[PDB]
Structures are given as structure tokens and as C-alpha cells.
Design a protein around this ligand. Structure first.
Ligand SMILES: CCNc1cc2oc3c/c(=[NH+]\CC)c(C)cc-3c(-c3ccccc3C(=O)OCC)c2cc1C
Length: 165
């Protein structure tokens, strides 16, 4: 499978996190949460705040310590001045396997995400299950078959994996 290796410094992310039961229905709630964020002007409002650290809107999957699963819609921003209205987290610095899903959203992303998870199962000592992973949606027509969503999967110690030796 094709991927690029990328590294991020610690970043500040501003947005809204919701929490679901780890879901066979999760994708339905995530759809609804996207729909609501657009409908309520939240996406537009976050887009203003995007400081450019990452180009686009993030959909982060955040593991919770009670086993639940959170999804956060966010942008790289600057201020905890937004805490009144928004969730603000620090995305801790990490290396990533960065994959591309090309096709109309969400179908291409869902399908690519299945392939990714199956691919990365061979890298159990190198993925980081407690670290967020995310979809990155850059500017473009997400209905276009050429639209590319990036999938960022955090890794540690990947250079030691025997497949690279
Ligand atoms: C700039 C990024 N813009 C978007 C990103 C989106 O990401 C989505 C991720 C999803 N899961 C994780 C992969 C699911 C389930 C739905 C998503 C939708 C979506 C949500 C509700 C209803 C329709 C769609 C839909 O994609 O709109 C198509 C017209 C979505 C829509 C837009 C506009």
C-alpha cells in the first residue's frame, strides 16, 4: 500500500468534539455531526480561524479512556481565547503514515479507511492506539471523483520494523 511518512510538531486544534459509543453506528452519527456543523455555521466559522498549519479541516478520531470513541471536527488555530465557544486541544507531536483516499466523500474515505486499517495491522508495535488519527479535508469539491482526502495514522519506531531491513 502507498503512503508518505510525515512528521508534525505539537499543534493547537480548535473545533468541536462529540463522543459516541465505539460504533457500528458511529459512521451514522459522524455523518449527522458533519451535517450539523455545516448547518449551524460551525464549519464556516472554524475555517476563518484556520491558521494554516495544516491546510483543510480535520476529522479526528480520539480514543477515550472509558473505551468510548470521540470524533472532533477541527482546524489548526492559535487561541485558547476560543474556549468559550470551542473545544481546544493540543495534538501531540508525532510521525505519521499518510494515506490518500481519492473519490467522493464519504464513500472513498470509508473504503480507504478499511484498507488502511487492514494494512496497518501488520505494524502493531508501530501504530499508536491511544493517539488520535485523522481525516484531512483540503479545499476542493468533495463530490469530485478526483477529490483527495488524506488519512493520517500516527506511528512510533517505524524505522525498526523488519520490513524496512
Ligand atoms: C471539506 C470537508 N467537507 C465534508 C466532509 C464530510 O466528511 C464526512 C465524513 C464522514 N465519515 C468519516 C469518513 C461521513 C459519514 C460523512 C461526511 C460528510 C457528509 C456528512 C453528512 C452528510 C453528507 C456528507 C457528504 O460528504 O457530503 C457530500 C455532499 C462530509 C461532508 C462534507 C461537506
Amino acid at each position: 500500500m502507498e503512503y508518505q511518512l510525515q512528521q508534525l510538531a505539537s499543534l493547537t486544534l480548535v473545533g468541536i468534539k462529540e463522543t459516541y459509543e465505539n460504533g457500528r453506528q458511529a459512521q451514522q452519527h459522524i455523518a449527522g455531526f458533519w451535517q450539523r456543523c455545516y448547518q449551524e455555521g460551525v464549519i464556516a466559522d472554524l475555517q476563518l480561524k484556520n491558521n494554516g498549519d495544516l491546510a483543510g479541516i480535520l476529522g479526528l478520531c480520539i480514543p477515550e479512556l472509558d473505551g468510548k470513541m470521540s470524533y472532533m471536527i477541527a482546524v489548526t488555530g492559535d487561541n485558547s481565547a476560543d474556549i468559550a465557544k470551542y473545544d481546544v486541544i493540543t495534538l501531540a507531536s508525532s510521525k505519521y503514515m499518510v494515506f490518500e483516499a481519492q473519490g467522493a466523500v464519504p464513500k472513498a474515505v470509508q473504503q480507504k479507511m478499511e484498507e488502511v486499517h487492514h494494512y496497518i495491522h501488520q505494524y502493531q508495535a508501530n501504530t499508536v492506539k491511544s493517539a488520535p488519527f485523522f481525516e484531512l479535508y483540503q479545499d476542493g469539491d468533495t463530490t469530485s471523483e478526483k477529490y483527495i482526502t488524506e488519512i493520517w495514522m500516527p506511528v512510533k519506531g517505524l524505522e525498526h520494523h523488519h520490513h524496512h531491513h
